[PDB]
Amino acid sequence: AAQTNAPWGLARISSTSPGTSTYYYDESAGQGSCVYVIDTGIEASHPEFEGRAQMVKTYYYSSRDGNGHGTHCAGTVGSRTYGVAKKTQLFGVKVLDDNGSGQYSTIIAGMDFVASDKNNRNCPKGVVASLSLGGGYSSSVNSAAARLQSSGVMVAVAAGNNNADARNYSPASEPSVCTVGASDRYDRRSSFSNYGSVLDIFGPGTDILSTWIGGSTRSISGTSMATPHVAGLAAYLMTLGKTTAASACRYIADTANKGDLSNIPFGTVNLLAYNNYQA
Ligand SMILES: [Ca+2]
């Protein structure tokens, strides 16, 4: 399948070259997979989600996304126009308040929630969790991410936006999950992207168009935007039967475009997420 005039990041993940604008993907499109977006929530009523998104948990007075961040990330995972995996089921878990903040205890509870809640859902092709969030190093936050992964969920987390080594941030520094840095449309490391040996992969993160609250759209930047490209790619590849939740991060790194990014510090992987879709 071909989506013309796609956002650059979608075109990038199905291309061996920067500078194109059509996204190519197998029509299965992540059908039968599930992706949990653990964030500020998701505006499930947005026409872009087509009834495939729902809120499953909140820790605040509402499950509504009063920020936009979670909606934007969920859009990059699975919206009809802005999404990588256009037929996946999206589940929102609101661990972040409408200011985009959340206590680590809440975030930990959200991760353990997903590890259990997947047993209440129909995801025959597999389960992914996208975590576009983080703060300073916490062994308890890393442990929660490690448990979620161990439970059979492909965990993708943002490297962070500090232009620093991700070893000092969580859940970015948990080795057993998939830690995602950000790139731009000219294949440069995004200016704010963290780096370091703990990164597994880069995805598109600078100037990413996606859904927003009030049934709107906008372009924003962050490792928060790179992460859902990878989460959606994993759901897409698991639907194709090419990989599993436990092995998808490794499979994505194995099949990545290699050595194409500029300003990658010595010792950080030079690997850009790629779906290797051949029509
Ligand atoms: Ca890892």
Which residues, in sequence order, are CB contacts of 214 under 8 Å at separation 6+?
Answer: 43
Compute, in angstroms, the gap from residue 176 CA to the centroid of ligand 1: 5
Place of tokens 């998939």: 178
Closest by alpha carbon to 143, among 108, 114, 110, 119? Answer: 108
**Experimental method used, please?**
X-ray
Compute, in angstroms, the gap from residue 151 CA to the centroid of ligand 1: 16
> In this structure, what token pair is assigned to residue 240?
């194709």
User: How far apart are the C-alpha atoms of 150 and 263, rounded to whole Å?
Assistant: 33
Contact 261, 183 (CB under 8 A): yes
Helix axes 104-117, 139-150, angle to 10 degrees: 10
Contact 272, 187 (CB under 8 A): yes
Looking only at the bridges linking them, the beta strands covering 53-58 and 23-24 are: unpaired
User: How far apart are the C-alpha atoms of 234 and 117, rounded to whole Å?
Assistant: 19
Look at the chain and report how many structural domains it folds into.
1
Closest by alpha carbon to 206, among 181, 243, 231? Answer: 181
Residue ranges for the binding site for Ca(2+)?
16, 175, 177, 200, 260
Compute, in angstroms, the gap from residue 117 CA to the centroid of ligand 1: 23
Compute, in angstroms, the gap from residue 256 CA to the centroid of ligand 1: 15
Residue 249, Ramachandran bin (φ over 0: left; ψ between -120 and 50: alpha; else beta)? alpha
Domain extent for 37: 1-279
Compute, in angstroms, the gap from residue 269 CA to the centroid of ligand 1: 11
Q: Report how far apart the first and last C-alpha atoms of the chain are (Å, whole number).
A: 8
| Distances 38 to 19, 20, 110 between C-alpha atoms, Å | 31, 31, 7
Cα angle for residues 273, 274, 275 (degrees, 5° grid): 130
- What one-letter code names the amino acid at 31? Q
Compute, in angstroms, the gap from residue 223 CA to the centroid of ligand 1: 15
In this structure, what CATH number is given to the domain that contains residue 18?
Answer: 3.40.50.200
State whether the Cα torsion 230-231-233-238 is positive or negative.
positive
User: How far apart are the C-alpha atoms of 204 and 108, rounded to whole Å?
Assistant: 27
Which residues, in sequence order, are CB contacts of 17 under 8 Å at separation 6+?
Answer: none
Q: Which of the residues are catalytic?
A: 39, 69, 224
Q: Resolution in A for the shown PDB structure?
A: 1.8
User: How far apart are the C-alpha atoms of 37 and 220, rounded to whole Å?
Assistant: 17
Helix axes 223-239, 248-255, angle to 10 degrees: 100
The burial class, CB within 10 Å (0-12 / 13-18 / 19+), for 195 is buried
| Distances 96 to 10, 93, 148, 244 between C-alpha atoms, Å | 26, 9, 18, 28
Residue ranges for the binding site?
16, 175, 177, 200, 260
Q: What HEC string does the chain produce?
A: CEECCCCHHHHHHCCCCCCCCCEECCCCCCCCEEEEEEECCCCCCCHHHCCCEEEEEECCCCCCCCCCHHHHHHHHHHCCCCCCCCCCEEEEEECCCCCCCCCHHHHHHHHHHHHHHHHHCCCCCEEEEEECCCEECCHHHHHHHHHHHHCCEEEEEECCCCCCEHHHEECCCCCCCEEEEEECCCCEECCCCCECCCCCEEEECCCEEEEECCCEEEEECCHHHHHHHHHHHHHHHHHCCCCCCCCHHHHHHHHCEECCCECCCCCCCCEECCCCCCC
- What one-letter code names the amino acid at 268? T
User: How far apart are the C-alpha atoms of 189 and 183, rounded to whole Å?
Assistant: 4
